[PDB]
C-alpha cells in the first residue's frame, strides 16, 4: 500500500501538530538553603541528596 496522492498542507498540519511533548509539573524543594524545583516523584531523592541539580 502506497499513498494515492500527496496530502494537503492543512491535512498534514492537523496530524503533525499532535506530535508534542507533555510538560512535567514541578514542586519546590530547598536543599542546604538553596531552593530548587524538581518533579514531585523525585522529592524524596532531592531531600536525601541524590539529585544533582547541575
Amino acid at each position: 500500500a502506497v499513498p494515492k496522492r500527496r496530502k494537503s498542507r492543512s491535512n498534514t498540519r492537523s496530524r503533525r501538530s499532535q506530535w508534542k511533548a507533555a510538560k512535567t509539573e514541578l514542586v519546590g524543594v530547598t536543599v542546604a538553603g538553596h531552593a530548587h524545583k524538581v518533579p514531585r516523584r523525585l522529592l524524596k531523592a532531592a531531600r536525601l541528596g541524590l539529585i544533582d541539580f547541575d
Binding site: 516523584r41 523525585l42 524524596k44 531523592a45 536525601l48 541524590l50 539529585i51 544533582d52
Partner: protein, 116 residues
C-alpha cells in the same frame, strides 16, 4: 515470590534468575545499589526473603540461601551482621528511592538500600 507477569527481565527467565541473584549479592555487599526502577522493584521481595532466612539463621536456612547466592563471603556477612541487625524488625528490610533517569535510553532509575 509472586512471579513476573509479562516478559522476564534481561530476555529470558534463566537470565532473570541470574540477574536477581547478582543484584541481591551486590545489595548485601554494599548496602546500597543504583539500578533501573523495574529491576529494583523486582529485587525488593526477593532480597527480603533471603534476609528472613538469615534472621532465622540455622544451617538449613544457610543451605537455602546458598541455593541462590554463590558468593560465600556475602553469605557470611548476611548471616553474621545483616540478620542479627534486623532481628527485631519484622519485614520491610529495604527501601526504594526514585532518582533521575539516565541518558542514552531515558530509563527510569532508582536506588535500593538496606534500611540501615
Amino acid at each position: 515470590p509472586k512471579p513476573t507477569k509479562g516478559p522476564r527481565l534481561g530476555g529470558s527467565s534463566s537470565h532473570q534468575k541470574a540477574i536477581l541473584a547478582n543484584l541481591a549479592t551486590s545489595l548485601f555487599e554494599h548496602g546500597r545499589i543504583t539500578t533501573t526502577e523495574p529491576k529494583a522493584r523486582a529485587l525488593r521481595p526477593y532480597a527480603e526473603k533471603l534476609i528472613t532466612h538469615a534472621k532465622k539463621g540455622a544451617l538449613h536456612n544457610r543451605r537455602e540461601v546458598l541455593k541462590k547466592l554463590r558468593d560465600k563471603d556475602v553469605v557470611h556477612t548476611l548471616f553474621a551482621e545483616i540478620g542479627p541487625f534486623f532481628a527485631d524488625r519484622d519485614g520491610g528490610y529495604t527501601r526504594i528511592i526514585k532518582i533521575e533517569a539516565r541518558k542514552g535510553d531515558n530509563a527510569p532509575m532508582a536506588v535500593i538500600e538496606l534500611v540501615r
